[PDB]
Amino acid sequence: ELIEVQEGKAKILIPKAESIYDSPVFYNPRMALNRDIVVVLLNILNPKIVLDALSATGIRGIRFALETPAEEVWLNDISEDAYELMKRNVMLNFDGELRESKGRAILKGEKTIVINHDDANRLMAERHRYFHFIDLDPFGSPMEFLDTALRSAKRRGILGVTATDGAPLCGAHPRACLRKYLAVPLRGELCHEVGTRILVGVIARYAAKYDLGIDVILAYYKDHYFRAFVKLKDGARKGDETLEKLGYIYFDDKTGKFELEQGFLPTRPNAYGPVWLGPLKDEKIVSKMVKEAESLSLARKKQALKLLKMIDQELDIPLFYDTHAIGRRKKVEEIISALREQGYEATRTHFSPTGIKTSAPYEVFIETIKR
Ligand SMILES: Nc1ncnc2c1ncn2C1O[C@@H](CSCCC(N)C(=O)O)[C@@H](O)C1O
């Protein structure tokens, strides 16, 4: 029936089954890294009232309460069996008695834990402008909840969205991408960043009508999923400035050369987007994350540090050059060094193991790898 496992400072019971998609209550251990990062981040932004929209086993919210400054943690899931496993796992990491009720339970101890058996769109809708932080971790696309989450979070709240929607976001299913994200995807060596930027840009677009803009705290790709942490800005002016960060991409698949164009609409044919052409991180914050992550007991510390450091030293410039792909048409360390000697900025990128982000033009990049 149930197996007791441990993640971070959390001890939970998960159903034992053939695969993760076969257990009555979902739990993907590979997502431990995803939860480490949000924990590291929360230990910086220090949100007071947080929400684990689609909790499943309750692991995320449970780690929120045990490993972060969060004072009021809300756990929610539409599934009855999940709700029951959530209540159990909560009482497995916290003391006192759970004052349960019809599909709703509460625990008022050092931290306040609100466990809910409800539909996320229903809960969030009841909780208008209530959370400092909301974490959306759905099966694939978050579009079904995005709009309601933008109304449930404080006008200055933080929104965490994950998208395991690789197929549409990476160009495999262009028509599916158009329906869910209202953007024309780009496949190929760049689809990892473009997919991430499409994600940020759709949040930016949905937030604008509430006269809200965004600041990307951190956005990255990893293990086939897209993560986006954004800070909401109050004001039509902020909203307008956000939409101004949107743009389109032009890509020559024969050469690997790409071009960017800032604007709500493109002005040339064969445009990819719209996508977020703004920053993909808040360097000041990401740097602290590396420091914080080192002083925390995460579930996958080594990988968490390895990923955070990569992003920390990474250039925040749109797109990059994949040495392997272009090669088809030397070592990355050597190319980077040769680029820096000439005075250009160049760094590795978490998007690709052979990718290089640089301020050098396509042409110079090609000349340099040839020398
Ligand atoms: N409308 C809805 N409201 C609340 N939960 C929903 C929902 N639609 C689907 N779900 C569900 O979302 C799941 C996503 S799996 C989620 C995992 C996670 N947060 C972690 O770190 O483990 C299931 O438990 C489930 O029943």
Side-chain angles (χ1 to χ4, degrees):
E1 182 52 45
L2 299 178
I3 303 301
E4 185 160 70
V5 301
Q6 177 145 47
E7 201 188 295
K9 289 189 175 188
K11 295 190 177 176
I12 60 169
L13 291 173
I14 67 164
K16 184 161 181 51
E18 200 185 3
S19 62
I20 56 182
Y21 313 96
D22 284 359
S23 57
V25 180
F26 191 85
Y27 174 73
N28 186 348
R30 196 75 196 84
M31 290 306 273
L33 185 53
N34 172 298
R35 293 182 287 274
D36 277 340
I37 309 308
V38 54
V39 162
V40 174
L41 176 66
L42 260 54
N43 269 295
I44 291 184
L45 269 27
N46 304 152
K48 187 185 58 187
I49 309 173
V50 309
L51 168 64
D52 180 5
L54 306 84
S55 213
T57 65
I59 176 57
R60 194 171 294 265
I62 287 174
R63 291 190 57 182
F64 279 176
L66 298 179
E67 303 169 49
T68 87
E71 308 187 311
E72 189 178 302
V73 187
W74 287 56
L75 287 68
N76 177 81
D77 206 286
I78 198 175
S79 172
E80 173 54 39
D81 287 358
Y83 178 55
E84 286 174 342
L85 185 47
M86 266 153 77
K87 292 192 297 183
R88 192 168 179 182
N89 286 319
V90 167
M91 296 316 272
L92 204 66
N93 295 274
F94 292 93
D95 290 310
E97 219 82 6
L98 203 60
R99 199 308 197 311
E100 39 189 6
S101 182
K102 311 84 193 69
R104 185 207 301 288
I106 187 159
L107 175 64
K108 303 185 177 184
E110 171 161 56
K111 252 80 184 297
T112 291
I113 298 184
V114 186
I115 319 181
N116 303 268
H117 177 201
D118 195 15
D119 162 25
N121 282 321
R122 194 170 196 295
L123 177 68
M124 292 191 279
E126 303 179 11
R127 286 295 125 219
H128 189 78
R129 302 292 166 202
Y130 185 88
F131 305 87
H132 297 304
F133 172 66
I134 290 185
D135 194 353
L136 295 180
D137 185 54
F139 285 136
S141 164
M143 301 317 302
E144 186 87 28
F145 309 102
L146 188 62
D147 190 70
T148 308
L150 285 172
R151 266 178 291 101
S152 197
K154 297 281 187 180
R155 293 187 63 82
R156 276 184 172 70
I158 301 166
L159 193 55
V161 179
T162 309
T164 323
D165 230 13
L169 287 183
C170 279
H173 301 162
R175 284 178 304 192
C177 185
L178 219 61
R179 282 200 307 283
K180 302 165 188 173
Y181 301 104
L182 299 169
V184 178
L186 171 60
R187 50 196 161 73
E189 59 253 60
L190 276 46
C191 80
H192 286 164
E193 186 176 333
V194 173
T196 304
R197 287 181 181 284
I198 282 176
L199 212 217
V200 172
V202 78
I203 306 177
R205 286 182 287 150
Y206 269 76
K209 59 183 179 301
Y210 300 112
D211 283 1
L212 295 173
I214 70 164
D215 280 316
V216 179
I217 293 166
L218 171 69
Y220 66 93
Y221 167 77
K222 174 70 177 185
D223 309 316
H224 304 297
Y225 66 73
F226 301 79
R227 247 303 191 180
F229 292 97
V230 304
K231 173 71 172 187
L232 300 175
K233 314 304 293 182
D234 195 332
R237 54 215 58 64
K238 313 292 170 58
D240 293 323
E241 304 174 300
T242 300
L243 303 188
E244 291 167 5
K245 301 297 181 62
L246 298 175
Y248 300 82
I249 297 165
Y250 298 99
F251 189 72
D252 185 321
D253 38 64
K254 295 172 292 180
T255 68
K257 187 184 186 308
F258 62 75
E259 278 164 43
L260 315 174
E261 173 180 41
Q262 215 170 65
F264 192 88
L265 298 182
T267 65
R268 298 160 52 194
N270 313 303
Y272 289 99
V275 306
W276 178 256
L277 289 184
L280 278 193
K281 68 173 181 175
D282 185 309
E283 250 310 66
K284 181 167 284 64
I285 295 177
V286 171
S287 281
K288 304 190 176 188
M289 287 186 74
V290 185
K291 165 82 174 303
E292 180 68 2
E294 301 177 313
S295 55
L296 294 180
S297 46
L298 311 173
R300 303 288 191 285
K301 186 151 182 168
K302 51 290 179 309
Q303 310 173 217
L305 285 165
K306 178 164 155 285
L307 171 63
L308 285 175
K309 283 179 174 63
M310 173 61 90
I311 293 175
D312 186 54
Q313 64 79 242
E314 190 175 304
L315 219 58
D316 207 333
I317 186 61
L319 306 185
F320 59 88
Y321 299 110
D322 188 286
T323 306
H324 186 291
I326 282 182
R328 280 139 41 181
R329 299 147 181 167
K330 313 180 300 184
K331 284 187 178 178
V332 179
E333 267 187 1
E334 297 187 65
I335 300 169
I336 293 178
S337 293
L339 280 175
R340 289 176 185 178
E341 316 184 302
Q342 302 181 68
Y344 300 105
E345 290 171 298
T347 67
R348 293 173 178 276
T349 181
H350 75 81
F351 288 118
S352 174
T354 68
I356 289 182
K357 285 181 163 296
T358 184
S359 69
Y362 174 74
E363 297 69 30
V364 159
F365 185 75
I366 301 300
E367 302 179 338
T368 304
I369 64 184
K370 287 181 172 184
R371 284 189 306 259

